[PDB]
Amino acid sequence: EMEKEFEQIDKSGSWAAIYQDIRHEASDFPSRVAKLPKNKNRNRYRDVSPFDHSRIKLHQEDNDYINASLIKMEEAQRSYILTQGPLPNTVGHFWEMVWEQKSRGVVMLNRVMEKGSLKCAQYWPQKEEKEMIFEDTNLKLTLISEDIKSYYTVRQLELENLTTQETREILHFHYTTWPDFGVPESPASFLNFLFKVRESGSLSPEHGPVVVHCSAGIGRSGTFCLADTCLLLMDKRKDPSSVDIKKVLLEMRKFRMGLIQTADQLRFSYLAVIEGAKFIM
Ligand SMILES: CNCc1cccc(Cl)c1
């Protein structure tokens, strides 16, 4: 059981060591499309690339590339698209992907500015009466409503395909209180946020996969889909303590490199799952 595994690693301070075994065991697949010179300005970080086998393809004949990966967790019946925070030049591609994949929710785990630098383009409207038009992908985005709470904001957005005049409602779940350095002290507000995303229907199989991002789409984004998947597995299995968080992480790393960036994020993931396990129990 992971509660006991937690105490062992914690009392022995072995988090950096566990984390290095995961780094060592992790899959390595080609990412040739990401490294093409025509895609250099579609990547926020030169060392964070989608694998060719799991990459999301845009339906535009010109250049189908976006820094985004489909993570398919077969046993849990959960899919996620993990992507980087959009760049000034990829905001149109981002919304095209949301449209093409029939996503119902976008989960954002960063602030636009952190540590005095921009981590993400402002890719949604700030006011009802000032909609955004993405001329390159022929989409219009309107803010419908905004519910600001202490730890997160939920926004209802309307996405309109200007080509076909179809409209969809998108929910934007913005976790606003992840600290600039390290991880939250307590996983309580992160769990509350994760249960709010679940309650919306955004993670349900009747929609396309949820889009999850932070700045690179590997660290905080990783923690989100690791916690969700592990809790769902502990609710599906005969024996919930058969769920090994290290195994689940390695399965997710087949689909996108580098998920969980630090030993601190790994510790936090255990804590979130343990406490989320305490919940529902
Ligand atoms: C939802 N996962 C928590 C858990 C742990 C152990 C047993 C059950 Cl039914 C659920």
Kindly report the three-state secondary structure assignment for every residue of the chain: CHHHHHHHHHHCCCHHHHHHHHHHHCCCCCCHHHHCHHHHHHCCCCCCCCCCCCEEECCCCCCCEEEEEEEEECCCCEEEEEECCCCCCCHHHHHHHHHHHCECEEEECCCCEECCEECCCCCCCCCCCCCEEECCCCEEEEEEEEEECCCEEEEEEEEEECCCCCEEEEEEEEECCCCCCCCCCCCHHHHHHHHHHHHCCCCCCCCECEEEECCCCCCHHHHHHHHHHHHHHHHHCCCHHHCCHHHHHHHHCCCCCCCCCCHHHHHHHHHHHHHHHHCCC
Q: Which residue has the tokens 């994020």?
A: 265
What is the Cα–Cα distance from 10 to 247, expressed in whole angstroms?
19
CB 193 within 8 A of CB 173: yes
8 Å CB contact between 97 and 58: yes
Q: Is 219 annotated as a binding residue?
A: yes
Q: Are 270 and 2 in contact (CB under 8 A)?
A: yes
Residue bearing tokens 């600039």: 180
**Resolution in Å, one decimal place:** 1.8
Cβ-contact 83, 70 below 8 angstroms: no
Distance 280 CA to ligand 1 centre (A): 6
Q: Whose CA is nearest to atom 7 of ligand 1?
A: 240
Contact criterion met (CB below 8 Å) for 248 and 272:
no
Q: Binding site annotation covers 217? A: yes
User: For residues 72 and 199, what is the distance between their CA atoms, to the nearest angstrom?
Assistant: 20
Name the experiment that determined this structure.
X-ray
- The closest alpha carbon to 62, from 38, 98, 87, belongs to 38
214 as an active site residue: the answer is yes
Residue 39 CA to residue 62 CA, distance in Å, equals 12
Burial tier of 272 (Cβ tally within 10 Å: 0-12, 13-18, 19+): buried
Q: Was 253 annotated as part of a binding site? A: no
- Rounded alpha-carbon distances, angstroms, from residue 188 to 37, 172, 185, 195: 43, 20, 9, 11
Q: Say which residues have a Cβ less than 8 Å from residue 47's Cβ, sequence separation at least 6.
A: none
Protein residues with CB under 6 Å of any ligand 1 atom: 231, 234-235, 240, 277, 280-281
| Interval between CA 96 and ligand 1 midpoint (Å) | 37
C-alpha span between 234 and 241 (Å, rounded): 7
Q: Name the residue of 78, 226, 281 to mutate for ligand 1: max ligand atoms within 8 A of Cβ.
A: 281
Q: How many CA atoms lie within 13 A of 226 on its CB side?
A: 33
Reading the block at residue 87, the tokens are 């760049």
> Domain containing 47: what range?
1-281
State the total domains in the chain.
1
CA distances from 15 to 11, 179, 259 (A): 10, 20, 16
Distance of CA 32 to the CA centre of its chain: 23
Instruction: Judge whether 43 and 34 are in contact, CB under 8 Å.
Output: yes
